[model samples]
Target: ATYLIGDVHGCYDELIALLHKVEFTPGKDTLWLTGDLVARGPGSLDVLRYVKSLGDSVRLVLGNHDLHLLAVFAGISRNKPKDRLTPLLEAPDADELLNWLRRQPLLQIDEEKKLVMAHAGITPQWDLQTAKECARDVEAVLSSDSYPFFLDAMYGDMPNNWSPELRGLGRLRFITNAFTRMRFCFPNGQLDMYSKESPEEAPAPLKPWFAIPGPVAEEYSIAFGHWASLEGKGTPEGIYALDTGCCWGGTLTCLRWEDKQYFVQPSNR
Candidate 1:
């Protein structure tokens, strides 16, 4: 069985319990992670080591915190004390782990399963194909020797919507935000990254990304993290919101995708 898990946020013990709860067998059952694998919790280094050890059994998308880690690694951003990333940053294998992370995709599409996933939901302005291309455009940059240039250019919340003509840093920044930081978007196709409130609490012009109608690849279901405020609710049938904020003392959730059965583990610390 394939298990689709939510944002882990360095909660290694909870992650372990959730895996055990689901009886996850390393080689036999594929584990798809929705990302934010590090930050704010006590065991980021442990989480990275174990996840890397999983090797072929695991797959993941990159989240905002994951990108932030890359920026810090690249010397483009400082490692904040609150994130508790010091151990991972100081580890001997930090480069190996971070390099592997940068090479991972910003978006993952299981074509056969007709399923798509990004750390945050795909932008309502894009079809899955366009979204995939945009994600790859950024992925290629992050995986290359010149990644720091892009990482330095990665921060910001401008060029708030998509257009065929938008290019350069602004383009990549928007793409990254949509995949990593997006929560609410204006119906006019503009994004508002600051709001972390639930749908009911959002300003009138804003709605959850999935609430808007713009995925041209409408047949595929989408799974995502990044919005712990949702508590894994409010999406339609084809969309899954899995971030339950285990780092904030909520449960870590994993789904048996084939049956849509959820296995949860409470925070250990």
Candidate 2:
């Protein structure tokens, strides 16, 4: 019996209020996050500290913003002036905080309960094992000494499709894009990262990843965030989309799997 939450892009105030609304009690119940716990808000540092304070009661899946913060803190990337995440990057606990964040799994498995948690939706091409294995590969790099190197070379828009031949950062990039920033993908599986508008505005030729039919493997439920623009609408099925875009003046959503229930905390700013 765990409660799954959506993206918490440093919305400490909103998160605190939402937690209260949900009556989340540490140790008594488990809380899982779809990631992007930092960035784009005023209290990234506070959010990290507070969440970490929960000890083992919380579980998190990696989101694009989470990865970016790790990259920035590792000196693999730099924060822009437009971004207000320096408070987190410069926090006294930045080292410890970022290290904890880096260790978070991109995908999680709760086999006894047959539940899967991920930052973004999983592709139909992959089953649980494939997804977990892919995640482990990326986590290995991020957890190793070469993590900075990988982050430095992480940005790109090339070879926008997956192939067995893809190598170096290309492979890693594909995995990152697919698991984190991916929205719609072309029929051939090339990603379309441009649109954040309504689902109606998604590429005509491309459909949401969950819409892909004749699936390779998609049995268990997956919890994810990252498509804040979608509001909170997920597939008619149980592909929980938690990202309500609190940073963009939307609601903050949390899905409590214990009772198979959902909760929303509205945000106007």
Candidate 3:
């Protein structure tokens, strides 16, 4: 069986409980994470080590927090003390872990199962093919020797709208923002990167990204995290909001892909 789990945010004990609840068997079962595997918790180091131990049994997309860690690692951004990511920064296997982290893509798709996972929402502007292509673009940059250049240029919200004409950092930044920072958008498909409000509280003319009709939604089931305000509900049909905010005292959640059953564990950190 395959399971799709929500944002972990470094809550290692809760992750253990959730896995226990699901009775996970590494050889027979697979786990897919919506991302944010570390941040704002007491066990970021343990989480990284344990997840790495799982190896091929796990797949994950890069979340905003995950990207932040990389930026800090590259000395492109200052580490926020509250984030609790410094232990990972200073670990003995830091280079190995960071290398593994940087190699992860912004999107993971199961074409046969018709499912897609991203840290945040996929921009309504891109269908799965285009989204996958764009993901590969960023993955190449992150995995290459020139990754620090992209890391240096990856911040900011300018050129918030997507365009085929976009080039260079603008193109990469837009793709990164869409996959890791987006939530609400104007009906025109322009992302509102500054607003982190819940769907109901989102200012008018700006609605949840999923509410906008797109080929990706029509063709596949999307699972994402980064927005915990939804409390795992109120998404457009076929879209799954999985970040139940375990690091913020919410529950850790997992959805069994084969049976559509859910398993949850309260935060134990």
Candidate 4:
């Protein structure tokens, strides 16, 4: 069976408990993560080491926090006390872990199952092909010598809307936002990029990305993390919101895709 877990967020103990609850076997059962593997919890370094040790059984996409960690590691940005990532940054294996993270793509797809995974949903504006292309575009920069350059310029929320005419850092940043930072969208399909409120409580004229219309979902199933406020609900059919905010005192959720069975572990912190 294939399993997908959302937003471990450095909750290593909960991750372990969740996996153990499901009896996860590394090679016997494939494990996919919706990312945000670190930050805001007590054991980020352990999380990285454990996930990496899962070897070929694990599949993951990079989340916004994951990219922030890279930027912090690159010296492009400094760590903040709230993030609780100093221990990871100071780890002896920091370079190895971070380099592996840097090499991870922003998206993963299971062609046969038509299952798409991104930390944030694939932006509604793009068709599946367009999203894949855009993902590869940023992926090249992240895994190449130009990552720091891209990281340095990756901040900001401009170009909230997509355009074929867009170019350079703006384009890359937009792609990154769509995959990593997005939560809400304006009526015209422009990304709001700021409101993290739950759907019903969010201000007027903004819709959760899933509430917007798109072509990607017609032919694919999407599983994503990052918007932890929803606690894994409110998405449309064929779309799955997997983050349950384990780092925020919620539960760590693991889904057995084959049976649609959910396994949750309450946060130990």
Give the number of the best model, judged by lDDT. 4
* Candidate 2 residue pairs in backbone clash: none
- Kindly list the per-residue Cα lDDT of model 3 for residues 1-269, writing each as its tens digit: 99888989889888998898888999999899888998898788888888888888998899888888888899888989999988888999999998988998789888899899999978899987889889999999999988888988989897888888999989999999999999998998899988887888877999999999988999899999989887888987789999888998989889998878988888874
Is 2 or 3 the stronger prediction by TM-score? 3
Poorest stretch of ten by lDDT in candidate 3: 260-269
For model 4, the superposed segments whose C-alpha errors exceed 4 Å read none
Candidate 4 achieves a global lDDT of 0.90
lDDT of 4 by residue, 206-228 (tens): 88888877888778899999998
The CA lDDT of each predicted structure is 0.89, 0.77, 0.89, 0.90
Per-residue accuracy of model 1 over 78-183 as CA lDDT, tens digit each: 8899999999999999999988888988888887888888899888899877997898899999999999999999899998989869989899989988889999
- Please give the RMSD to the true structure for each candidate, in Å: 1.1, 1.9, 1.0, 1.0
TM-score of each: 0.97, 0.92, 0.97, 0.97
Please give the TM-score that candidate 3 achieves against the real structure. 0.97
The 10-residue segment with the lowest total lDDT in model 4: 186-195
Clashing pairs in 4: none
1-269 per-residue lDDT for model 2 (tens digits): 57887888888898988888888899798888888888887788998899888878988788888888888888778787655887777778788988887877888778776677777777665656666667888899888877888777767765566665677778888777778877776776567777766677775897777677513235676667888777777565757778888877888887777677777877746
Residue 79, candidate 2: C-alpha displacement in angstroms: 1.3
